[PDB]
mmCIF file of C-alpha atoms (C1' of nucleotides) in Angstrom:
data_model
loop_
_atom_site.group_PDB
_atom_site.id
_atom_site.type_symbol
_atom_site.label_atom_id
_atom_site.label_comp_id
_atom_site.label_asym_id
_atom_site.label_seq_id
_atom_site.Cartn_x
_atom_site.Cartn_y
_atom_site.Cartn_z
ATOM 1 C CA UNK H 153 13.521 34.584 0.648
ATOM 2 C CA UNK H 154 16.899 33.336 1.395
ATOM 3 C CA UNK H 155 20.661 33.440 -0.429
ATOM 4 C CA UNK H 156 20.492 29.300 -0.063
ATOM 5 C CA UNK H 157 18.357 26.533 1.125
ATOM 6 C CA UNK H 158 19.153 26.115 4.767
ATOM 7 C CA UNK H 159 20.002 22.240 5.595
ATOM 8 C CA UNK H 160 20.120 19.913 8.572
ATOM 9 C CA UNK H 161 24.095 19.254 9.068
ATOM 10 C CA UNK H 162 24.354 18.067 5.782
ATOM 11 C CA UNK H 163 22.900 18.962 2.117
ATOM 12 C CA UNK H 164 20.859 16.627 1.390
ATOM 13 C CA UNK H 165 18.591 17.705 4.566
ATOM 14 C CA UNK H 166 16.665 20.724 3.671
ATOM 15 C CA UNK H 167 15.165 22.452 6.282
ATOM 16 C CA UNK H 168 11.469 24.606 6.174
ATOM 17 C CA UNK H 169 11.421 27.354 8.703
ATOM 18 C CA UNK H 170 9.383 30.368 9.727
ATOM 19 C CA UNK H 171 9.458 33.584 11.714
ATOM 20 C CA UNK H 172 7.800 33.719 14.939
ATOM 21 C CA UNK H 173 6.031 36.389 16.596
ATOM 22 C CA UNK H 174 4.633 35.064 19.475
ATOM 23 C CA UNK H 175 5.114 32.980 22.786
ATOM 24 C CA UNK H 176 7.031 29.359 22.793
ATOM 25 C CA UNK H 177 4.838 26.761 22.996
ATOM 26 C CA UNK H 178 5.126 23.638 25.437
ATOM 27 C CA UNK H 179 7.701 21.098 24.858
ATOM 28 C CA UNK H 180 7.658 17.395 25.032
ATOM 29 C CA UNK H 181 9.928 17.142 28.390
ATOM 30 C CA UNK H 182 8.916 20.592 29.453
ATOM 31 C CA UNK H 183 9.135 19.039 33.232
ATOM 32 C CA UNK H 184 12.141 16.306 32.819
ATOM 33 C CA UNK H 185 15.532 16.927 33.266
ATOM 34 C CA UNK H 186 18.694 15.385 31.203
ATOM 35 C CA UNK H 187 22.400 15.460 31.134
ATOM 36 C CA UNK H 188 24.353 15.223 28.060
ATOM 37 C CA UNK H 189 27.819 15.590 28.676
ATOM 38 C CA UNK H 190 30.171 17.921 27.157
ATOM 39 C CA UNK H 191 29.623 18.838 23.766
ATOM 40 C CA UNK H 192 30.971 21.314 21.045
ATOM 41 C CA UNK H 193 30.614 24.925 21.429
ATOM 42 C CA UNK H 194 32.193 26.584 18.450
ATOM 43 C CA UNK H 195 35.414 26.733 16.060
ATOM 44 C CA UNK H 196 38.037 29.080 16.417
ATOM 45 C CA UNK H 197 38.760 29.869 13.144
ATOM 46 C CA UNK H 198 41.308 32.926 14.078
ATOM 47 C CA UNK H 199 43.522 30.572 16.603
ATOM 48 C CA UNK H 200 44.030 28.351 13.549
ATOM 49 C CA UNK H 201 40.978 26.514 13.674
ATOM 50 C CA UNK H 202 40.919 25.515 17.633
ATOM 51 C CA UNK H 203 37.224 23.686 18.848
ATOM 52 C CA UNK H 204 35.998 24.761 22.373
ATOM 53 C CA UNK H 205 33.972 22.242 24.637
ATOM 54 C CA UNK H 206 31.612 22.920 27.373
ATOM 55 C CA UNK H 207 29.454 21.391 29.958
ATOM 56 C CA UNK H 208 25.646 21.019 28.368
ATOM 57 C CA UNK H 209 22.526 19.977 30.704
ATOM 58 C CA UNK H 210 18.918 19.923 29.410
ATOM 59 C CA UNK H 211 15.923 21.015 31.511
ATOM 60 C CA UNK H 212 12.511 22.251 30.626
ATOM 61 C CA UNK H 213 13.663 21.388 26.798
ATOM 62 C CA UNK H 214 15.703 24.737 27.268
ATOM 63 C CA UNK H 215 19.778 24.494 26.766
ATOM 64 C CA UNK H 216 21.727 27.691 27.460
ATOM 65 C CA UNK H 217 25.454 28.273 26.097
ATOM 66 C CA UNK H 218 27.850 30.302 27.445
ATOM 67 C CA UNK H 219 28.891 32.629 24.945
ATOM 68 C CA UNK H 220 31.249 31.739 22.753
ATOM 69 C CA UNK H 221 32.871 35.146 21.961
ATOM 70 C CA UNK H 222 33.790 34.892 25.955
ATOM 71 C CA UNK H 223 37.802 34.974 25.877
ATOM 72 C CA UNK H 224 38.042 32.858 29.262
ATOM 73 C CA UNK H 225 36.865 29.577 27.206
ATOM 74 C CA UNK H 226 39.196 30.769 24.838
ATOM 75 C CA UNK H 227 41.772 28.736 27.250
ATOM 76 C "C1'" G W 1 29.105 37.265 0.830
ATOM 77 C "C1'" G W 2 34.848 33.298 5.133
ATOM 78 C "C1'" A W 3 33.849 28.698 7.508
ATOM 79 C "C1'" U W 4 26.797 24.106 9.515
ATOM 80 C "C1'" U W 5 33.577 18.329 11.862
ATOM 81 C "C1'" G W 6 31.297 21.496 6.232
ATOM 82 C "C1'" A W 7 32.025 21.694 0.947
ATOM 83 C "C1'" A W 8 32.601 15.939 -3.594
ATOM 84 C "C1'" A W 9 30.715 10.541 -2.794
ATOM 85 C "C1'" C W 10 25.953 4.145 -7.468
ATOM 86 C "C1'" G W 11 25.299 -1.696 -4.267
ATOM 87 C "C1'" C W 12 27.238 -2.717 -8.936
ATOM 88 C "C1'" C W 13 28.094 -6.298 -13.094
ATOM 89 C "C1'" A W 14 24.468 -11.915 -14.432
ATOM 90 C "C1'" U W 15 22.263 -17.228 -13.688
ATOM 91 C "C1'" G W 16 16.287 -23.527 -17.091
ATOM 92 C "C1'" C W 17 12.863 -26.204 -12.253
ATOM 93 C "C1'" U W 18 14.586 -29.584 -15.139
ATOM 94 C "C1'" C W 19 13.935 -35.079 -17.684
ATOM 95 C "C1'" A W 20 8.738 -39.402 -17.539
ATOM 96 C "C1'" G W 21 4.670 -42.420 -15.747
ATOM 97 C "C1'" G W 22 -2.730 -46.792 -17.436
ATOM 98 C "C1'" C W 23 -7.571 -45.700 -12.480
ATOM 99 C "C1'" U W 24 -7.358 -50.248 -13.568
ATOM 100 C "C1'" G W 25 -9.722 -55.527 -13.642
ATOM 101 C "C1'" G W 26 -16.352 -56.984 -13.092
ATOM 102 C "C1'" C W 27 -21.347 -57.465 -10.794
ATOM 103 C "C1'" G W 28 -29.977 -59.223 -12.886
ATOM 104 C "C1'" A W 29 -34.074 -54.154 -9.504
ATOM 105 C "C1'" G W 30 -36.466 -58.574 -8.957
ATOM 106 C "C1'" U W 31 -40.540 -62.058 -7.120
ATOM 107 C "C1'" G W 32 -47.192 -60.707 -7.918
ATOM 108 C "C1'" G W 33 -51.969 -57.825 -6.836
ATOM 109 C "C1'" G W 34 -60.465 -57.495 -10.260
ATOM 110 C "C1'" C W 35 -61.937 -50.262 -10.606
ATOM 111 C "C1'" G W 36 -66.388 -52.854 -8.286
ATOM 112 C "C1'" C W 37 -71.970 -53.256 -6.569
ATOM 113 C "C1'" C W 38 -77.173 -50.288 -8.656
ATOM 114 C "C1'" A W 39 -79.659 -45.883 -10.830
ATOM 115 C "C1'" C W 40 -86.775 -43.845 -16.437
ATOM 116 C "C1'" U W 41 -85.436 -37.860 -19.803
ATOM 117 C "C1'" C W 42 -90.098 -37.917 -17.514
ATOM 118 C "C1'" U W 43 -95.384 -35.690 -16.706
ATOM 119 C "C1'" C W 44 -98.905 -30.806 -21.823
ATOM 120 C "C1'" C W 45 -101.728 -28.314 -25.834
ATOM 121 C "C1'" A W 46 -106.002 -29.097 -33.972
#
RNA sequence: GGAUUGAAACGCCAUGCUCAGGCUGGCGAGUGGGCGCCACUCUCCA
């Protein structure tokens, strides 16, 4: 069930999805490493509608954030 | 039930492959070659 179809970025992208329940499987550069520059991290909608950048590296197919709710990016 | 740099967003209207031209004039299948040599229907019952 859902209240909408999820999309892609844009509408006319739907999106199928599932619940998992188990372990992740492998990825395709599970043993590569990548740089991507910085890249978007969120919207602040309460500090009239400020974006937030931060530094994003892929390794193992795994990227971690920093949180966003984290008032030092806030700066 | 606030917010996926998102929510809305036509590649569209239409255009001849056309007019016309001979595969034609003409050439012998023709000269001549034995089906021949010889062979019992024949031996019986008023």
């Amino acid at each position: 069930q859902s209240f909408q179809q999820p999309c892609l970025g844009c509408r006319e992208f739907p999106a199928s999805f599932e619940l998992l329940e188990g372990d992740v499987p492998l990825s395709c550069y599970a043993g590569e490493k990548r740089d991507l520059g910085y890249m978007l991290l969120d919207i602040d909608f309460e500090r009239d509608m400020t974006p937030l950048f931060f530094k994003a590296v892929m390794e193992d197919g795994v990227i971690t954030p920093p949180s966003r709710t984290s008032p030092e990016v806030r700066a």
